[PDB]
Amino acid sequence: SLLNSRYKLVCYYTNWSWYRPGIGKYSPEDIDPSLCTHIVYGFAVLGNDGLMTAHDTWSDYDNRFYERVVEYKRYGIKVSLALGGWNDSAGDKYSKLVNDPAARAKFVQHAVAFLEKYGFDGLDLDWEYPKCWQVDCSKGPDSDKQGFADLVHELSAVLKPKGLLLSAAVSPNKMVIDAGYDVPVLARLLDWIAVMTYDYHGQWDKKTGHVAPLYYHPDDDTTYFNANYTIHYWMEKGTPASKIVMGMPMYGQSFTIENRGIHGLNIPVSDGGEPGEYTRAKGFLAYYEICDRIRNSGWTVVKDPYQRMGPYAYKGNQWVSFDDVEIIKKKVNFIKSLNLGGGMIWALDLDDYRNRCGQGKHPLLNAIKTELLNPKI
């Protein structure tokens, strides 16, 4: 059992996965309670009054989604509510909050009351990102760093006496880490830090690359866009291994390549890949969309024999990079080797939970669980 093990497995749940057709629909009762130690509900948002508020009242309240995910506390799972996410991080509103002590003080007391009203065990902070708003370090002031650290302290000071958890999802990018995070403060006060060791590459690069490399590859533009560098950098900056949970993607980054005739890494790209029929987002495909393309549409798979990164797959002018069971096992052995706090997945509804691909239900998440529970390293 994961709950009796020395590791966390932090699973993100997404309310918007309900609005998908056919087998892509995911509801709270699709959560498999044997596969997670912690569930984090994405997302609540920052209202115009500076207070946390539900993003989707129809699902979260009227259809009782908050209650139906908090249900999983009955299995011993800790259920937190996440605030923010990529879309909610587009503007200045989190920066305005954290730079205003009076606004922080109002926010904190209301946020704890909100968590207690719905029965959540904690709050997960998902501002992407302090200073570097949506990765753009030119947008925010340097004082976002101190402001976020003070927000974390003020939340900790209310949550910890009530026995409530406080965590954050954080950037894997050296420049963002340096600009946005007072790492010693966060490492001391947070119960865990979920490092988002994915989205290192995507359509925005204008060339193909892997969503989530584990180790440096000789053709990389930088030495730091890989999970091994990122995790060691969080530790070098002052984070204890026990506080780190390493993110793993249940999806791939897709690309429209300029030329069907070359199809390797670092080749020119004109746009994101064509949207999947279930997830409906250019540049993104769920694992259950990728595995079907490979199994039933003849996409060609290229693996890295040194296992520095997972596979990519292509057909015509479409190309996608993603994690398979093999690289997941390697990544979990890496987690164990460094004695990290555990693993994290984005997100439950993107793995093949329906066994559309015939590899079993939840092939990626089950691979993580099995490797975490395996004593050998």
Ligand SMILES: C=CCNc1nc(SCc2ccc(Cl)cc2)nc2sc3c(c12)C=CN(C)C3
């Ligand atoms: C057009 C700009 C938007 N780009 C992005 N979007 C996301 S949201 C993912 C998501 C979630 C749910 C569903 Cl259903 C579909 C997709 N994440 C990231 S990390 C990153 C970018 C980026 C972009 C540049 N950066 C350098 C790095």
Ligand SMILES: *[C@@H]1O[C@H](CO)[C@@H](O)[C@H](O)[C@H]1NC(C)=O
């Ligand atoms: C992992 O990262 C550490 C620290 O940056 C480095 O010393 C080590 O060589 C890396 N492992 C690789 C590249 O296999």
